[PDB]
Amino acid sequence: EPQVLCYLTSWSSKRPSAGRFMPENVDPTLCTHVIYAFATLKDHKLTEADEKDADMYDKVVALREKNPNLKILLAIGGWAFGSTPFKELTSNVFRMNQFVYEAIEFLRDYQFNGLDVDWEYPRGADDRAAFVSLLKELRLAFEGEAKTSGQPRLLLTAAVPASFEAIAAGYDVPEISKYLDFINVMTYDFHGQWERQVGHNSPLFPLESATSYQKKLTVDYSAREWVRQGAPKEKLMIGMPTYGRSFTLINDTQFDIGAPASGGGQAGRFTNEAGFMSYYEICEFLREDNTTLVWDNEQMVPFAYREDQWVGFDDERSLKTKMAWLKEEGFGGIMVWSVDMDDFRGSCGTGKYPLITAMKQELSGYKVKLEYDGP
């Protein structure tokens, strides 16, 4: 029973031509859960972010009609949303409780299977306690509802950071682990266009020559840090990105990890953000002339460069390798960011959804079992 939780970004519907992604585009057999991001808070209540969203919620749910075991969740928060609304949400019990009772009604009305909470990020003791009370109250009310109610309990999940420093600052790990059904660790964005050296978005292992700090910026170390802090392995869903992060090189002849960079790489035609590329945009980049693909055998991920453009990403081989690591460590499953950025049209020349397919096939047969795993 390894789980596969796939994020669906609302704004993917706004991309041009082939990029355009709609709930209909979702293969309902790929993922065990689809998490729709993001709803918002208005007057401290769970509400639809845009008036056009309600029809989208309807479309995402009802994927179910095509796979009745598929769970559909709604996410609130995200990076843009910030910390202040969550702080104000949890500032008093009545607001908090009323948010809780209405969220349940909101969710039951749309027939969602549960709520994903993405506070980015709690920081400091007051936030730490507030995040715990919020999760504690959602969880208990979800249960209480299932009993005073008819059906199966609403699911509760949260996206959490990979940075070991963010973990200490924001997360009472053992406490949140009691209330969450799934802990979705964001094991990506380790490097990017905010830095002035080239580095990979989501390296599995570090370079042997890495500084003790750079060694921590990896999928492997992050996931292990979550375990070390008390997260139950069966609830830990390790984040898998279907995008890459790109750089403009200072010097075309310097293209190795650590090479000087002036900023992000040229935007992809569909995601329109320098420094960022969806997987189908990567494939386009790779078929340009003279683009050299490299396999980093220490980090265990690919990257590619052509003239002053450099991109670090995940492909079939790196994701499969990650699944092998995953099973060996014994984690409960994966989280995918995001389903709309995998090559859902099969324009890379392999199949449709080649990234998620590759992970799914490599996960076939895996059963998660807890056992003593040393310190």
Q: Decide if 50 is inside a domain.
A: yes
Q: How many angstroms separate the Cα of 47 from the Cα of each of 40, 42, 54, 88, 127?
A: 6, 6, 10, 16, 23
Q: Decide if 216 is inside a domain.
A: yes
Contact (Cβ atoms closer than 8 angstroms) between residue 359 and residue 5: no
> What single-letter amino acid sits at 280?
Y
Q: Decide if 267 is inside a domain.
A: no
Q: How many angstroms separate the Cα of 91 from the Cα of each of 102, 122, 136, 367?
A: 17, 13, 15, 41
Q: Decide if 126 is inside a domain.
A: yes
Q: How many angstroms separate the Cα of 364 from the Cα of each of 2, 324, 333, 359?
A: 9, 11, 11, 9
Q: How many angstroms separate the Cα of 291 from the Cα of each of 161, 174, 347?
A: 33, 47, 18
Contact (Cβ atoms closer than 8 angstroms) between residue 57 and residue 372: no
Backbone angles phi, psi at 96, to 5 degrees: -55, -50
Tokens of 159: 């996206």
- Enclosing domain of residue 84: 3-241+314-363
Identify the sign of the CA torsion 152, 2, 234, 338.
negative
CA distance 239 to 156: 17
Strands 236-241 and 182-186, by their bridges, are parallel
> Can you give the three-state secondary structure of the chain, one letter per residue?
CCEEEEEEEHHHHHCCHHHCCCHHHCCCCCCCEEEEEEEEECCCCEECCCCCHHHHHHHHCCCHHHCCCCEEEEEEECCCCCCHHHHHHCCCHHHHHHHHHHHHHHHHHHCCCEEEEECCCCCCHHHHHHHHHHHHHHHHHHHHHHHHCCCCCCEEEEEEECCHHHHHHHCCHHHHHHHCCEEEEECCCCCCCCCCECCCCCCCCCCCCCCCCHHHCCHHHHHHHHHHCCCCHHHEEEEEECEEEEEEECCCCCCCCCCEEEECCCCCCCCCCCCEEEHHHHHHHHCCCCCEEEEECCCCEEEEEECCEEEECCCHHHHHHHHHHHHHHCCCEEEEECHHHCCCCCCCCCCCCHHHHHHHHHHCCCCCCCCCCCC
> How crowded is residue 28: how many other Cβ atoms within 10 Å of its Cβ?
17
> How crowded is residue 109: how many other Cβ atoms within 10 Å of its Cβ?
9
Q: Decide if 251 is inside a domain.
A: no
CA distance 168 to 105: 34
Backbone angles phi, psi at 245, to 5 degrees: -125, 135
- For the chain, the domain total comes to 1
Resolution (angstroms) equals 2.2
The closest alpha carbon to 100, from 63, 141, 49, 55, belongs to: 141
CA distance 120 to 374: 32
Strands 292-296 and 301-306, by their bridges, are antiparallel
**Dihedral angle, C-alpha 337, 363, 299, 329, nearest 10 °:** 110
> What single-letter amino acid sits at 273?
E
Angle at 159 between CA 317 and CA 229, to 5 degrees: 90
Q: Decide if 19 is inside a domain.
A: yes
Q: Decide if 7 is inside a domain.
A: yes
Q: How many angstroms separate the Cα of 137 from the Cα of each of 131, 177, 182?
A: 10, 14, 16
Identify the sign of the CA torsion 28, 33, 34, 39.
positive
Q: Decide if 179 is inside a domain.
A: yes
Which residues does the annotation mark as catalytic? 120
Contact (Cβ atoms closer than 8 angstroms) between residue 100 and residue 141: yes
Which residues are registered as beta bridge partners of 238? 185, 334
CA distance 80 to 118: 11
Q: How was this structure determined?
A: X-ray
CA distance 326 to 364: 13
CA distance 34 to 339: 9
Identify the sign of the CA torsion 102, 107, 113, 119.
negative
CATH for 7: 3.20.20.80
**297, exposed or middle or buried, with CB in 10 Å at 0-12, 13-18, 19+?**
exposed
